[PDB]
Ligand binder design. Structure first.
Ligand SMILES: CC1=N[C@@H]2[C@@H](O)[C@@H](O)[C@@H](CO)O[C@@H]2S1
Ligand SMILES: [Cl-]
Length: 529
């Protein structure tokens, strides 16, 4: 009987729990935020059919007022085989090691003996929820050595009388419409294809993404006696409006590197050759580039204006310009300024020498830190400044690598608040390769480089749509934190500064103490209520 006893504990959801973690549930939220609870179990014998059910979470003053809970998810583990090459001091464990990341959507799971297993409870709290203290329990059941085991864990959610609606922060995660590794494989233009696209869009909006990257070149068809048909593009845009993302439309890149890292940029064009529309890359100063873009850009602008989408749209030229290919970059910009002067231009950038050439700057975080005075000047001049993270930066900078503390994902949006950057970009929503992302966590990059685990995807392939990671959850939470700090700063700018300054000490230095963070959150909620 002793060996059948289930050990149960609760762990803050900002703390990652390993299979061999040592034993150690209240959530404090605004109306409109998501509450998360992490319940952890272990047993000296194997468990079959582990299951959890959330009971009614009811208000003490009125048992009729209930919160609605999402289906319970189990934390999944992935093997991180190779490390961040320049790791942070606070790296959670040294690879190789198994890390918690995916949120699985299984009704029941098995657990091997003496393996710690986290259970993840999500409660989305609508804005019209009555403030108060909601209480209930989670019922955990399963089978051990034949016999049914069952236990109830008490939980509480305090809903503060402060409404967090849409966050004013702009957030994009670049997305690839693909069904790799899923149990479905829809063909383009099938009903299931459009249904899966809608499911991704809903996932993105439920995590406070409000920008989507959509290519006006690859989602159009061309006839060239030029006529451009944007039907496919428009279907994408409609779906992302309907599911609550758009928001803003980020136009897919016109061009890219001709070869290696310092090579000149080329632009894609469409041409009639031997009766067929063909696509090729040309120099942006070429006559072929001029002929194409003189007709395509006005068609795009006219199309966006007619649909009421022009003021929501910004166009990418070519990714990550550097000093050594700045001239070819500037030649793309010149085409767009010439033939589409009304179009806003956005770019993830390394070089800063682009004044007049772009409207929405998106420097890489360490480049922003290093050139902060330039970026603040661009803001005074009326430009928008965001930032991104990716394979870089590494070291002590915040990022969404699996090896990092979860607060480094969440505090990215505290960096946005402290330094006045009004949006955030990441390239890596779901960039799964041919190998399973559950078993091959370090994707191949340029030459001998690999991408650190966590960089290419924040969601995983489920049976028929995306599965969240814990990092996706932390990102959503930070985007809401930004809105709360912004609401406080409207009323009490000095109090908002003091609170953000407790966790963002510099661009590359933070306080990731979870107890401290929860204390700051509670002060923020108390001040606003
Ligand atoms: C905006 C960006 N562009 C690049 C992407 O296409 C990927 O190669 C990524 C790898 O981390 O690095 C940077 S982030
Ligand atoms: Cl270790």
């Amino acid at each position: 009987k002793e060996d059948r006893i289930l050990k149960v504990w609760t762990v803050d959801p900002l703390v990652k729990v390993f299979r061999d973690s040592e034993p150690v549930a209240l959530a404090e939220v605004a109306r409109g935020e998501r509450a998360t609870l992490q319940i952890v179990i272990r047993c000296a014998k194997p468990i079959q059919e582990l299951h959890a059910k959330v009971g009614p979470l009811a208000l003490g003053s009125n048992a009729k007022q209930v919160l609605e809970s999402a289906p319970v998810r189990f934390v999944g583990y992935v093997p991180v085989d190779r490390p961040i090459p320049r790791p942070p001091k606070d790296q959670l464990r040294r690879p190789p090691a198994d890390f918690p990341d995916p949120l699985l959507e299984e009704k029941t799971i098995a657990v091997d003996e003496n393996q710690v297993q986290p259970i993840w409870v999500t409660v989305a709290v609508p804005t019209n929820t009555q403030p108060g203290l909601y209480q209930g329990s989670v019922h955990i059941s399963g089978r051990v050595d034949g016999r049914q085991i069952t236990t109830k864990v008490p939980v509480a959610i305090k809903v503060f009388d402060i409404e967090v609606g849409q966050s004013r922060l702009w957030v994009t995660n670049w997305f690839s419409m693909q069904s790799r590794h899923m149990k479905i494989a829809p063909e383009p233009d099938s009903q299931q294809y459009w249904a899966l696209l809608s499911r991704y869009a809903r996932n993105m909006s439920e995590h406070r993404q409000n920008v989507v990257l959509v290519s006006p070149l690859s989602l159009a068809t061309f006839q060239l006696d030029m006529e451009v048909d944007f039907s496919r593009f428009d279907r994408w845009v409609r779906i992302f409006i309907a599911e609550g993302v758009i928001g803003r439309i980020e136009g897919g890149h016109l061009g890219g590197r001709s070869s290696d890292w310092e090579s000149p940029f080329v632009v894609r064009i469409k041409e009639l050759r031997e009766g067929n529309i063909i696509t090729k890359s040309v120099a942006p100063t070429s006559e072929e580039a001029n002929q194409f873009y003189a007709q395509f850009l006005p068609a795009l602008v006219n199309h966006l204006r007619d649909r009421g989408w022009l003021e929501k749209y910004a166009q990418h030229l070519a990714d990550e310009p550097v000093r050594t290919n700045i001239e070819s970059y500037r030649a793309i910009s010149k085409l767009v300024r010439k033939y589409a002067p009304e179009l806003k231009i956005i770019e993830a950038c390394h070089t800063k020498d682009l004044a007049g050439a772009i409207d929405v700057w998106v420097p890489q975080l360490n480049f922003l830190h290093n050139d902060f005075e330039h970026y603040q000047k661009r803001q005074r001049a009326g430009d928008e400044v965001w930032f991104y993270t990716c394979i870089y930066p590494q070291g002590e900078y915040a990022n969404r690598f699996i090896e990092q503390p979860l607060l480094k994902t969440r505090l990215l949006h505290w960096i946005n608040y402290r330094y006045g950057m009004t949006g955030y970009l990441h390239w890596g929503y779901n960039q799964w390769g041919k190998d399973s992302p559950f078993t091959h966590t370090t994707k191949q990059h340029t030459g001998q480089q690999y991408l650190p685990a966590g960089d290419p995807w924040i969601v995983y392939p489920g049976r028929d749509g995306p599965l969240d990671s814990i990092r996706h959850e932390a990102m959503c939470d930070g985007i809401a934190d930004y809105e709360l700090l912004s609401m406080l700063g409207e009323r009490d700018p000095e109090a908002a500064k003091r609170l953000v300054n407790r966790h963002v000490l510099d661009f590359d230095r933070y306080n990731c103490n979870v107890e401290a963070f929860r204390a700051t959150r509670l002060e923020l909620l108390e001040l606003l209520s």
